[model samples]
Target: SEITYSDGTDYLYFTTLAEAQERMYDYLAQRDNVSAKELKNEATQKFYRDLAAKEIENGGYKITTTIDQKIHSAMQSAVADYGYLLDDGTGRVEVGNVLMDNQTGAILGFVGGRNYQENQNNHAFDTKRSPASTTKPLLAYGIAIDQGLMGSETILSNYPTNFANGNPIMYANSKGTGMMTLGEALNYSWNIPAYWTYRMLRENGVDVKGYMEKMGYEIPEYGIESLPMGGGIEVTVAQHTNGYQTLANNGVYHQKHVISKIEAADGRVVYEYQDKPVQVYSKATATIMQGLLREVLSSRVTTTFKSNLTSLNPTLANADWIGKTGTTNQDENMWLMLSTPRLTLGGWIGHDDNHSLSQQAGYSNNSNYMAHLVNAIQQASPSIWGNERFALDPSVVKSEVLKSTGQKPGKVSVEGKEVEVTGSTVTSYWANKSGAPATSYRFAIGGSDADYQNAWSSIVG
Candidate 1:
C-alpha cells in the first residue's frame, strides 16, 4: 500500500519516496544536462536515493510484503536467543554463529562469539581459536581414507593405545583391555585407541605428515606427538566444519568454505559450494568412519555422545544430536561442537587471558553446558531448515562407489554408460533369498557376497 498520512483533513500520499525523490534530480539534471552534467545527474541520483531511503526509515515503517511472516518471526525470535535447530537435531548455533549445509558444504552464515562483553569482538567469525578435538576426524580419519590406510571394514588393530610419555587411557570407563577395533575406537573418541591406530600405521611406514598436509593441519612448534590427540593445536569452527564434512562426503574433502552458487531470496543463483571439493578420503573409508562415529553415540560404549549432551543439558536427554565437545586446559576455554547436517558451531566459552571461568559459572563455563545451548538450538532448527529447505539443495551430482573397493566407483564406462558408484548405492537386489543384482542392468564384478572381490562387475540389462 502507498504511504498516506492525514491530519483531521484530507490524506496526502508520500507514495514511493524513491520516485518522488527522483524528481529532486529533475531540478538539478534539467539545468545540468547541458554538457557539464556528468557529475551533476549522478550526484543527484545518489543524493535522491539516500534521501528517499532516510525518509522511508523516518516514516514509521510497516512491512509491506512478506511471504511467511510467522516463520521469519520465529527465526528472528530464535536468533534473539543463543540456540538454533535443524531438521534432525538441536544444538548451539551462536558459540560460533555459523551456517553450513549438511549435505552440500554450503556455509550460510557465521557469527563468532568470542567476547560477549565488548562489541569490539562479539559475534565475529574470524577469530582463530583452538578447535581442540573437533578437528581430529578430518585430519586423522578423513586423511587416512584419502591415504589408503584402511576401508570401512578394514579393522586395523588398535595397538599402542596410549600417550607416548606413558599416559593412562581413560576411555571406555577405564575398563577393557588390549586392542579396540579401529571403528569402535575412533567413534568413541578413544584418544589412546586412535593414538595407537596412528602409531601402528606410522610404524608400518605411513607418512603421517603427508596426511596432515592434506588436511591443512598446522603442526605446532612444540609439544605435539600426534594428530588424534589434543596437544599442541589451534583451529577454528569453520575449519572443523570443513574437515567433518569431508568425512561425511565419503572422505572427499571439499575445501569447505566456498559457496559455489548462490540464489537471491528471489531465487536467483548468487553463490554455490562448487569448485570440486578435495578428495579427502575414500568412499568406503568415509562410510566406515561415519559408522564408527555412530558407534561412539550408540547404545554401547556407555553412550558418551548422549551422555555428554544430557550431562551438559539435562533437558536434552530426549533431543537428538550427533556432536562432540572439548575443554581447554584448566577450563580456560570450552567448545560446544557441531559439524554435520546443519550449522558448524564452535561454542568457544572462555576468557582471553587464558584464565579459567572459575570452578563454577554454571552453564557459561562447563563444556557440557553447551547442551543447554544445543537444546535451545534444536527447538528452532526444524523451522530454520523448513524456511530455507528450498535454498540449500546442492545440485551437484555425486560419484558412486566401487563394488570391490567398497568405495565410490572411480569413473569407468561399461558399454559406454557411465555409472558413478556413490557409497550409498549397492548393486545387489533383495531377492528374499541371497542378495542378487536388483536391476537387470546392474551386475557385480564378483560372484557371491562371501567372494565379493574380483567377482563383481556391472553389465547391461
Candidate 2:
C-alpha cells in the first residue's frame, strides 16, 4: 500500500518476503506504516543482501565490487579455516605462505582458494584492521639488504631473555632458541635473532619510520603497539601484496592491475589493471633476498616444498614454493606466498572480535597450517595455466653470504649466555651457553654419551 511512482517507474514496498507472496506490503500494513519501515527490522537486510549478492555473483559487478566479493569467496575456498589475498596486479605476496618469483604486478593470474573449514578463522590481510606485522618479513629481509646486513654466512643468535628467576626466555621456543645463523634465524622463525636483525637495521641508520613510509607504514588503524615491536604498522592486502611482489620482481614495484584487461558482457574493452606502478624496491635487493629466503625451504627448518622443483618436489610431499608467515599476538594473521617465475598471493584472517589467535588455535597463530594451504594452491596454479614451473626463470638469488648484522653487540655478562641448539641437542647441553658448536659438545661426550644426543638413541642408565 506504500507503493510510489518515481520518474514513471513503479516502486513497491514490503516488510517481509514470505512464501505466500501476498505482496509483502500486506504484512507490513498490519504492524507499521510502510514508509516508516527500515531494513534490519528482522531479516530484511540479510534477505535483500543475499538477493542482490547472488544476482551479481557471477560477474557484472564493478571491478572493485568483484574483487571484494572474491575476497570472501577465496577465503572460503582456501578451506584454510580462514584466509585472504590482496593483489596489486603483480607478485604473489602474503605473510605466511612462502613463495618467490618475478612476473608479478598488473597481469597476474588466479591462484586457487579451495580449502576446508578450520577451527580458527583469524588470518592476515584484514580490512581496515590490517597491521604492520604484514610487513615484518619485508622489513626483516628488505631492510637487511638496504642496510647491507644481508648474506648467507652471517651468524645470529637467539639469546634468551631472563627475568626474576634468572632463567632465560626465548620467543620462538615451540621449545626455545639456541644459537642460530641469520639465515637460520629467518628459516626457524627464531624471535631473538629476528629482533637482533631489527637492531642491525637501526644501527645502520636506516630510518625505520622513513623506510616504512615509502613502504606505506602509517599508524595502525587497529591500534597495535607501534612500529618495530608490536610491529604496529598497517597495510592493505593490495599494498602489502604489491610490496612483496616488488621484492619478487627484483625490487621493482609494478603498476596496479586487475583483470589484466577486463571486457564487459557488452564486448567493449571495459576495464583493465593499471599500466604502471611506482618503484618500490631494487632488483639487487630483491634478488639477494630471494636467495636468502629460498634457504628456508630446505629441510633444516621444515621439510622442503617442491612442486615443479622436480627430482625433489616438496609440494609433492606437501611443500612447494616459498613464502612468509605472520601472527599478531592473537587478533590477526597475514601471509604472503609467491613462486619463482611469477605467482603471488596475500592471505589474511581475523575474528569479528579481533581478540587473538594464540588464545585459540587457528590460521593466524597456526602459520604452518596456513602455509600448507598456500603451498597446495601454488603447486596447482601452474598446472591450471598449462605451464611448467621448472620452465620459469628464477631471479638471481645468493646463498649464505656473511654481512655485518649492523648491530653493535655490547659487552655484557658472560655467565648466563644461552648457546645455540636444535630440538635434539638441547637436553644434554645443560652445561653452558657457550658460543661453541654443538659438534664440540658431542666430541666432549664421546661415543658412550652420543646416544643421549641422538633422538632415536635409547637410555642405558
Candidate 3:
C-alpha cells in the first residue's frame, strides 16, 4: 500500500504509481522485485508521477470500472480461437472486443489481444486501422435520412457498375445485382448503391468527411471511394463501439470512460460517474438504422450470416439482433459491429503483419469465431439475451408520395424538381416530423430488369 492524501484526508491504498521501479512494494509481493536493485530519476516517466499525484488528490483512490471480469475472459477465449494460429505455433493474429451497456454507456467488457508477453499490439482499442464498409450506417443511411436524400423505400441500383469518374465498382456477387431499396442495399452490402448514395450526399452539400470528423473519427482523405466503402481511413475498436453505442442510445454519443467510481480503502466513496452525451443523428434516424441492420441477420437476405451463426451454436438465434460486417482490402482486416436492445459490441480480426487471413497457410476467418464468442457471453449471462429492439419513434410517420411528380409528401424544397418513374411507381416511407421528405424524392424500382435499369439510369444520368 502507498500513502496518499485527498483534499486534506490522508489514507493508504494499493499502488497508484505506473512505473515498475516506483512500485517496489508491489513488485516485491509479486516475486519480480528487480526494482530493489537500482533506482533512478522518476521525472522521465510522466505517467507514474501523474498517477501518484492523482491518487493523493483523490483521497487514496480506489477505482472501480464498468468492466466485467467474466465477460473479459470470454472475450479473451473468443479472440484466441477466432484469430488464426501460425504454422510455427505462434498466434500471429491480433483481435479485440469492446462491449458496452446500451442503457448507461458503460463499457462492460474489453479484450485487447492474446499474451502481451509475446506481443504488444493492442488491437482492441487501437484506432490506427480503417473501419472498412462499416462506415455505411453513419455516413450513408444516417446522413441521408436526416438530409432527406433517400428513404428506406427509395430504390437504388445494385447493378455492377462504374463510378461517374470511371472508378470500377463491384457487388458482393451476382445475387447483389438488380435494383433494391436503399435499406436492402445495406442489408446485402452492395457497393454500387453505396457509391451512388455517396454521390447523392455530395450533391446535397453534405460533406462526408466533415460529418465523420464531427462524429469524432480522425479520418484522412482517400477520395469518394472511401466515403461509401470505408477506404483506408483510421478507426479503433473503442471508436467503432462508440459509434454503435450512439445508434443504440438513440443518437446520443456519450463520452466513453473506463473508471466508474473512485473510493477510499475504507469503502468511503469520493467520486462517481454521471452521464454526459452529445446528440449526433436524430433518434428516429438512429432507430431506423437499427431496424435495417436487423435484416443483416435474416436468413432470407444474407445467407453468409445465417450459416455462420448456425455453426457457432449461438443463443442469439431466438432474439432480435443487428450487426454490420466489414472487410478491408485484401481481407487483411475484418470487423463486426453488433448491437442488441441492451448492449452493443464490436469485434475485429487481423494480423499484426498486415497480411490477408485467407492467404495464410493455416488460418480460419474470425467472423465465425466472433459469433461463437458472442454465444459464449450470452450463455454466461442470461440477462444480456433479450428480444428488445429499437422502438420506432412516433415522429417517424409513414406516408406515400407520387414518385413521377417529385412532390414532397410532407414538405421540403423539391418544388421545381421532377423525377419520372416512367412506370407504375410510388415511393413509401416513414417521414419524420421535420418534414424531411420521408418518401423518395429520388425514385424506386418495382418492375422487370430492363425497366429497373432504365429507371435507375434515368435518375442517375
Candidate 4:
C-alpha cells in the first residue's frame, strides 16, 4: 500500500526514502546507458549508484551496506588521527587503509584519504603504488612455496651478489655477501636472496609473470627486474588487502566488497554477496607462508617490521600475527599488511603527487604512521583484533641449522683475500624436515611418550 502525507486541504502520495533511493540511480544510469553489471566491480557500481541516487525522490526502498557502523566510525576517526600523525610541514601526505573480513571478504572498514573535503582523490582503490618488500610474503615466498620451488631451509645469498642475469643485488643494511636460509632472506627483507631465487625460478621454467597474471597481478610483457624485491609492481589497498587475506584464509581467494545484502522497501531481497572462493594456493602453502610472515613480526633481526605493531598495540605483543612491511626505492611509498584469522588489514602512506615520503626540515616515517593506523584499528575494535592467531603445520617441519659442509671446504675471497676463518663461526640456516638431522640429541636418547610429544610441539603447534 502507498503511504500518503496529507495537509488540511490536499494529500500527496509519498515513496519511502529508502525504496526510492535504491532504484533512483539505476533509473538515471539507464538514461546514460549504464548498468551495474558493466561496472568494474560491485563496490564501484554500488558507490556510483549511491552517488546518483541522491538526486532522486523517495524510492519506497532502502539499502543495507556491509560496512559495520561502529567499525566505519572508528576507521573515520583513525583516518583523522592518521592525518594528525603525519602533519609534517611539507603538507599532509595521503593515506590509504582497508580492512576486510577473511572468511567472507567483506570490507569491514575503509579510509580513502586524509581530508576528502580538500583532497578528492580516492586513494583507497583508485591509486596504485609500489608494494615494496611486502610483495615478498605474497608474490615471492608464498607463490614460490606453492610451486615447490622454495622451502624454509632453501639456501640463499644475503650478501651483495650478482645474479646469473647480471643483476647486481645488495642488502639494504649494506651487509656483505653471506649465506642464509630462505626464511632469513624474507625475515630480514634481504634483496640479494630474493633476486637470486627469482632468477633461479625463471631460469628453471617457472613462468613468474604468468603466475603473477593468474593471481590478478597486472604485469607488462618485458618482465620486471625487481619484481620479487618489490619493484615494477603497483597495487591499490583493496588488492593488497585481498591478497594478504588469502594467506590468512588458507589460500582461498575471495572477491572483496562493501555491500553484503540489500533489500527492497517492500521487504524483498535484492542483493547479496555471491562471489565464489578460488583456491589460489594449497593449504600447506598458506601455512608455510603464514609461518614465514609471522617471523616478520617476531624475529628481532628483521628491523623492517619486527615488533612495530606490538609496540603500538600491546595486545598483540604475544600473539602469533603475520604481516609484511614494504618500502619502495628512495622511500617513494610505504606499506604494511596484517592478517589474522579474524581480519585482514592493508595500509599505505604516500603523497597525492607520488612524491617520496620525507622531511622538509626533519624526517617522515611512513612505517610508524601506518603502525599508528593499525593501532587505531585495534583500539577501535578490540574485540576483533586478537581473537585468532596463526597455527603451525606439522607436515612442514621447519628449523634453523648449520649451512656448513661436512668436509673442510676451500677458502673463498670477498673484496680482497677472504678473511681467515681459523675460528670463524659457521653460517646457520632454517631448514625443512629433510634438511634437519635425522637423529638429534633428544631423539637419539629417546624418552617417554609424553617427552616425545613435548619435544615435537614446535612442528605441530
Candidate 5:
C-alpha cells in the first residue's frame, strides 16, 4: 500500500515504492550486501534510502543541505544566461556549473540545467565528459611541480612532436613556436608542453594514477598516454571541480558534499558532515601553480580571458582570479574552471547528445559565455568574494631568469655548448628546495642526453 500527503508528495518520492524495492534488492544482490564504508558513496546512500523508504515516507525528519540560497539562485541565473547565448532555437546545448567552498569542500551551489521542468537530468553530477585542457594543470604541470621535475621557468620545445607510441601530437593552431617557458605553455594552453611534462613524470616513475585518484579524478585502465591532454578519460563536473579545489586549497583536498546534516523527528542529529582533508600535492607545488595559473587571466598574457571579463564586469578582471579554459575536439565541449580565494567554480557548455557546438550561433572560439556567466553570478552577490588573495607558501621562492634560456642572467650551456645570454628576463617562481631553474634548454622529450639532442634537432631541422 502507498500513501500520499496533503501536499501530494512523499519525502524523496521520485520513484514508485515497488520500483524502489526492486532497486534496493538489485543493489544488495550486486554488492553481496552493503558495508559501512559504502555509505559514504552518494549512490549507496540512495540505495539505503530505497531500502528504508517506508520509514522516510512516514515523515518527521528534517534535511539540511550545504547549498547557500543566494549562491544557488545566482548559479541558476548564470546558467539561464548561458543557455540564451547557446540557443540556436534548438535548445540542444546545455550548461552545468558547480561551485564549491574551497576550505570545507561544501557544494555551495550548482546549476544542473537551464530549466528543471524541461529537463530533469542533473548534468553537474550525472554527466561525464572529456575535460580537455583543464587536465593539463591536474595531471601534468601540478604533478611535475610536486615531483620537483620542473619549475615555472623550465623551457620546453613547443614544436610539433610525436608521442612515445609514434602518435603525432598537434596543437590547436597546428603549429608551435620553437620553444616556450612552462608558464607560457600553461597560460596559452599549449598541448605539446603538457604532453612532454607527462612523459617526464612517467620517466621519473611518478605514480600518475595514484595522484589522480587522490585528487578524486577517474582514471582509465589503459590508453592513458593522452591523459595530460584531457583525452581517454571523462569526469563529472563535481569530480573535475574538486581537482581545482585541491589546488586552490594549497594542495589539501576536501571531498565535495551537498548535504550538511539530517535530523530525526525528536531533533536528534542522525547524520552530520565531517571534513577530511587529504594532501594531494605539496604546498610548494600548489603555490607555484597558483602563480602560473594566475597569469591565464592577465591582460598581458591572455588574449580573451581578461578582455572578456573586463567587457562583462570590470571588477572581476581586477579581482584575484585564476583559471583554465578547455575545448574538446571539434568543439564538442567548452569548459572553464575558475577559482577565487573563497570558492572554486567549474562550468561546462556542451550538447547533451555529444553533437558539435562549433557552429552554434553566438559561439565564438573562446569561452566568453562562461566568463559572462561568472560575471553575472558575482554581480548578484557582491560580498561573497572578499578581497583576499591566495597565500604563498614559505617554500616558494622567486628568481629572475633569462626568458630565452630559462636560466640565471649569465652565460649558459645549451646541450653542452656555451652560449651568451641575450634576451629579456622575467621573474619566475620555483620550489626553494628544488635548487634553481635549469641552466640550459630542457627539450620536451626523453630524459637522456641523446634524446635531448634528437628533440633539438627535430625542432631546428
Candidate 6:
C-alpha cells in the first residue's frame, strides 16, 4: 500500500499504506474496470488487492515525470524576475508560463506564479484570459493557408472595416496601410486583415470552432466571428501554447502531458506515455507558416523584439526562432509564444483583478521580456535545445510575385488602365511551385474578380 516515486535515482516516499490502498482502489476502478464491491470479495481481494500490497512491500511504485530540472529552474527564475519588475509593493500583477517539447508534446516545465507560498493559484493552468492577437495564427492565417484559400504573398486590404454584425474593426494605429500582403498583416498583427481572413474562411464554410477545438481551445458557441482578433473567448497558458506547439511540430497535435512513465515496485512498467497524434494541418501548410512566423522575429518592423533577444543572448541570432505576440484591448493581458527547434514556450502577464497593465510604467514595452527569458533558458542548456533549423517539406517552395497583387509578374489592368507589372516583386512561400499564380490577378476569397475589384477599390480609395 505504500507509495513512492523517483526522478531516476532519488526515491522519495509519497503516501502511507492506508492512503496508498485507497488510491490504488480508486485507480483500479477506473483503470481496470473493476468495482469496489467486486474487489471487496475475498478471492478478488486476494488476487488484486493483495498483489498491490505485495508490490508495495518490495518497494513502492515509482512515477517518472517529464520535467527537466534545468528548464524548470530557468522558468521559475524568469517568472520571478518579471514579477519583480511588476512589483509596485502591492503584488497585483501575475505571471504564468508553460514549456513543452515540440516533438513529443511533453510538458518540460512550467511556472504557475511568482511565489507559491503567497498565492495558491496555478495561473498556468487555472487562469483563462483572452489570447489577443495571438489567435491570428491559430484561427485565421494558418487555417486559410492550410485550406489553400490564401498564400503567404496573398494580398489583403488592411483598412478600416466592419464585422459581419456591423461592428467596426480598427487596427492599433486606427488606420490601415491601404494594402498589404498576408505575411505583412501577420508579422505586424493587424486586426482588419485577420478579420477579413476569418470572413473568407466563414464564406468558404471552414469549421472555425472545430479547428480551434482540435488545437485544445474551448470555443464558445456564439461570437466565433471575433476569434481571429481574439475576442469573446479565453484560454490558459497551456491551452494557447498547444496551438503553437502544433505548428512547431509540423502541424501534428500531440497530447501534452507531465508524466512520462510509471513503474511498479519490481520495476515492471505499468504505464508509459503514448502519442496520439492528430494531423490538424498539412506538412506543407505548417512549413509555410513556420517561415512566416520566423520572419516576425527578424523583420525590420519588429525592431524591439529583434533587438531584445539578440542583445540578451547573441546566440539566439543564429538560432531558428519562430513566435507570435498577443496584447488584449487596453493592455489588460500580454502573451507571447516562442518556439525553438526543440521547444515551444508560452508566457502570459496580467493583473489578477483584470486591471489594465497600462497603469504601470513600461507596460507596453515590456512585451519583449518573454523572448529574453526564452533566450536565457536556451543559453543555459544549449545541448538540450540544439541549433538545428526547421526542415522544410519538399512540397513547400518559394517564388517571386507582384507585391501589390500577390500574383505572377505580368501585365494587368489596374483601375481600367493597362499596366505593365514587371519590376515590383517579393519572395513568398507557396505550398508547391505550381501554387504560385500564373498571371497578375487581384486576390479574392472564391475566385470572384468582381469582388476583388470592389474590395480593392473600397480599401484603396
Better of 4 and 6 by lDDT: 6
Model 1 off-target regions past 4 Å? 1-94, 114-119, 122-124, 142-177, 205-216, 220-223, 258-274, 299-321, 339-346, 357-461
Better candidate by lDDT, 2 or 4:
4
> What is the C-alpha lDDT profile of model 6 across 1-461, one tens digit per residue?
22222244311122124335444445555577877588677887666666566545665677566667676777677767765665444347778888888888887777787778787667777799999888888888888888777778888776556666887777655855466777788777878778778888878888777777887777765346777778877998988888999999999988776666656767776666778889888888888889888887677353255576677777765688888877887878877777877888888887788877753322334445665567657766776666888876788767768666777766655667765555467876776546666545455333234556665455333
Q: For each candidate, how many residue pairs have backbone atoms clashing (under 3 Å)?
A: 48, 75, 1, 9, 0, 0
Cα RMSD, each candidate: 15.1, 15.2, 8.7, 11.3, 5.9, 5.6
Give the clashing pairs for model 5.
none
TM-score preference between candidates 3 and 6, better one: 6
Q: Identify the runs in model 2 with alpha carbons over 4 angstroms from their true place.
A: 1-104, 107-134, 161-179, 207-211, 215-230, 259-273, 300-320, 330-338, 358-461
Evaluated at residue 170, the lDDT of candidate 4 is 55
Lowest-sum lDDT 10-residue window in model 5: 3-12
By lDDT, rank the candidates, best first: 6, 5, 4, 3, 1, 2
Position 104, candidate 2: lDDT: 40
What tens-digit string does per-residue lDDT give for candidate 5 at 162-195? 7778877777657555567787787777787787
Candidate 3 lDDT, 219-332, residue by residue in tens: 666355556588656788877788888877777777665555555678765455677767777777777767778777663343244456666664566566777877776767
Q: Judge candidate 4 at residue 420 and give its lDDT.
A: 21
* Cα lDDT tens digits for candidate 2, 1-461: 11111111100011011211232233333334434476536576455545544433354523221122222223335543433332222222222221222454542322222221222221222244443333545766566655544433444544444423565434434434344444666665555455556655655656655545554546533222223333556555545666667666656665333333333345544333444545454455555556555665553342222322334334333322445544565434434344443545554544444444432232222344444454344444534222333211242232311122211222322224433322212111011122222232222111223222341121111
Provide the clash count, candidate 5.
0
What lDDT score goes with residue 204 in model 1? 63
Local distance difference test values of all predictions, in order: 0.42, 0.40, 0.61, 0.61, 0.70, 0.71
Best by lDDT: 6
lDDT by residue for model 4 over 31-89, one digit each (tens)?
57775467667786887577756453344434444456566567777777656766554
Clash pairs detected, candidate 3: 127-236
Candidate 1 worst ten-residue window by lDDT: 4-13
Alpha-carbon runs more than 4 Å astray in model 3: 1-60, 80-91, 159-165, 172-178, 207-214, 221-225, 264-272, 299-303, 306-315, 359-364, 401-427, 434-453, 456-461
